Design a protein around this ligand. Sequence first.
Ligand SMILES: *[C@@H]1O[C@H](CO[C@@H]2O[C@@H](C)[C@@H](O)[C@@H](O)[C@@H]2O)[C@@H](O[C@@H]2O[C@H](CO)[C@@H](O[C@@H]3O[C@H](CO[C@H]4O[C@H](CO)[C@@H](O)[C@H](O)[C@@H]4O)[C@@H](O)[C@H](O[C@H]4O[C@H](CO)[C@@H](O)[C@H](O)[C@@H]4O)[C@@H]3O)[C@H](O)[C@H]2NC(C)=O)[C@H](O)[C@H]1NC(C)=O
Ligand SMILES: *[C@@H]1O[C@H](CO)[C@@H](O[C@@H]2O[C@H](CO)[C@@H](O)[C@H](O)[C@H]2NC(C)=O)[C@H](O)[C@H]1NC(C)=O
Ligand SMILES: *[C@@H]1O[C@H](CO)[C@@H](O[C@@H]2O[C@H](CO)[C@@H](O)[C@H](O)[C@H]2NC(C)=O)[C@H](O)[C@H]1NC(C)=O
Ligand SMILES: *[C@@H]1O[C@H](CO)[C@@H](O)[C@H](O)[C@H]1NC(C)=O
Ligand SMILES: N[C@@H](Cc1ccc(O)cc1O)C(=O)O
Ligand SMILES: [Zn+2]
Ligand SMILES: [Zn+2]
Ligand SMILES: [Zn+2]
Ligand SMILES: [Zn+2]
Length: 447
Amino acid sequence: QFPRQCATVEALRSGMCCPDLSPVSGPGTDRCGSSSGRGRCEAVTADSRPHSPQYPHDGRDDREVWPLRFFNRTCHCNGNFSGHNCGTCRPGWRGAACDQRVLIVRRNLLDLSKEEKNHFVRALDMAKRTTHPLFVIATRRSEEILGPDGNTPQFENISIYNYFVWTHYYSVKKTFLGVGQESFGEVDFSHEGPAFLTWHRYHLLRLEKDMQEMLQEPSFSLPYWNFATGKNVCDICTDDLMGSRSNFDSTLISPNSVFSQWRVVCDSLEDYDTLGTLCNSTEDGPIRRNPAGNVARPMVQRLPEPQDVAQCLEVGLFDTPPFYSNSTNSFRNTVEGYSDPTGKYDPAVRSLHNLAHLFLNGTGGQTHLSPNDPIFVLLHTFTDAVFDEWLRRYNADISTFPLENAPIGHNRQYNMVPFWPPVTNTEMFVTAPDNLGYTYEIQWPSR
Ligand SMILES: *[C@@H]1O[C@H](CO[C@@H]2O[C@@H](C)[C@@H](O)[C@@H](O)[C@@H]2O)[C@@H](O[C@@H]2O[C@H](CO)[C@@H](O[C@@H]3O[C@H](CO[C@H]4O[C@H](CO)[C@@H](O)[C@H](O)[C@@H]4O)[C@@H](O)[C@H](O[C@H]4O[C@H](CO)[C@@H](O)[C@H](O)[C@@H]4O)[C@@H]3O)[C@H](O)[C@H]2NC(C)=O)[C@H](O)[C@H]1NC(C)=O
Ligand SMILES: *[C@@H]1O[C@H](CO)[C@@H](O[C@@H]2O[C@H](CO)[C@@H](O)[C@H](O)[C@H]2NC(C)=O)[C@H](O)[C@H]1NC(C)=O
Ligand SMILES: *[C@@H]1O[C@H](CO)[C@@H](O[C@@H]2O[C@H](CO)[C@@H](O)[C@H](O)[C@H]2NC(C)=O)[C@H](O)[C@H]1NC(C)=O
Ligand SMILES: *[C@@H]1O[C@H](CO)[C@@H](O)[C@H](O)[C@H]1NC(C)=O
Ligand SMILES: N[C@@H](Cc1ccc(O)cc1O)C(=O)O
Ligand SMILES: [Zn+2]
Ligand SMILES: [Zn+2]
Ligand SMILES: [Zn+2]
Ligand SMILES: [Zn+2]
């Protein structure tokens, strides 16, 4: 989750993650591109405000007041610069001066030409096989991060797409208990609470940026899946897109799709929750997908209706107390899918984003594994298009987004876990076209 440069004994010892940009005069002489004016090494801001109660709750979780368990100094960039060392630009800008506005367009995957479709799944496949040039992932919790001999950082290289999967797993994993310790309350830094929409927003942005980097195609954009069709099939589960059903195992992907070759990460909950370890970069086992195949829950075998999207955009409040999966008249809880499309919570309703996950009846539905099915990307670009439309209709009314007593990870000014450099929910609560340099090509149901 941290730059390779910072995953060292010395940098953890200093508490400082301020890598060089262009260290012409030797190591440490252009931290954060300070010698060119691009940024400065400064103290991290981290939300201190209180969260909703948990029984029991030790507070030993390395995700509290993120990222302070590891670093308390990052790069703060000036102007429209950003990046872990301020070597790149804020979203929406390009150039060595970061002064050319760029605007990329995210579109319906089904609207793409045959050429762009092939480019997408090949780009996706590439990002699955290519080492992240920048981030490395911890395989051990903080108290063991430096190894048995105390001089060996427990960090692994990981692929671009697997990093996208890893960050999601880390945000939902259970707090370790140990030996003799009671069952700690279950927590979720990226679902069941207001930060769900902004966490996943940044999640996508980080993948888009990493893939534009990988391809050296600055305008590359992530497309989206309109799952609000009422359909009883998955209309992008074809061999020229996300993969059709295997004729040999009806829960596998057709061997004629590259995605049948993908192998998953983070599928060892039993190992982690007992050995005390974290998901690592070693893959094991294929994607399972079985659209409409959940015969035990008939509600989970059709997709959301088109009016479900239009109706949830009528919920005027962004979120409501207790800012949880049981909130009512809360647009966040509606689009996430724990309340019905009108606003009304019911513990039996599964709608929209949650409905779309369960529909897949496979790897795409398990909360710790779901990004391993690449349909995750396009399910979430769609969800984010709904978020972006809401932000527009209601001029980004951030007021009902709680500053405190939200579930842990979800306070308005929390640094979304485990993204780097630190980045608050507030920074994602903006219309995308003007403030984040992307927009959606989408028409909304007009009822
Ligand atoms: C920002 O981070 C700085 C770096 O700290 C690391 O990174 C952060 C993000 C965390 O991961 C942190 O745990 C990492 O260590 C941080 O500076 C560091 O602050 C710590 C905590 O105070 C310092 O450790 C303490 O040092 C004192 C005094 O130094 C003694 O040096 C020798 C060595 O033994 C002694 O013989 C002398 O008596 C010196 O006086 C120790 O008294 C103290 O030990 C006691 O406390 C610890 C827990 O803190 C217990 O385990 C012990 O048993 C003792 O009860 C600490 O070890 C550390 O030196 C310091 N490092 C540097 C490089 O400055 C900084 O404070 C953070 N800034 C902010 C604003 O929060
Ligand atoms: C996919 O759906 C199937 C069938 O709808 C699920 O397996 C059933 O789960 C129920 C409830 O837990 C069990 O009592 C049944 O024994 C299971 N049926 C069969 C035929 O195995 C399955 O868990 C779903 N998988 C995912 C990943 O969503
Ligand atoms: C939503 O779920 C929360 C969290 O479980 C519920 O809060 C509980 O409320 C009861 C009585 O009000 C307390 O005894 C529990 O300790 C609370 N749990 C926690 C974790 O704090 C709440 O009841 C639900 N809210 C609604 C509106 O139904
Ligand atoms: C990580 O990758 C970089 C280049 O991508 C390489 O220089 C380095 O040796 C790799 N690190 C490890 C720990 O294998
Ligand atoms: N109700 C489901 C919906 C869901 C949400 C997110 C996810 O990654 C996978 C999912 O399957 C759950 O909380 O497990
Ligand atoms: Zn706490
Ligand atoms: Zn600054
Ligand atoms: Zn998620
Ligand atoms: Zn999701």
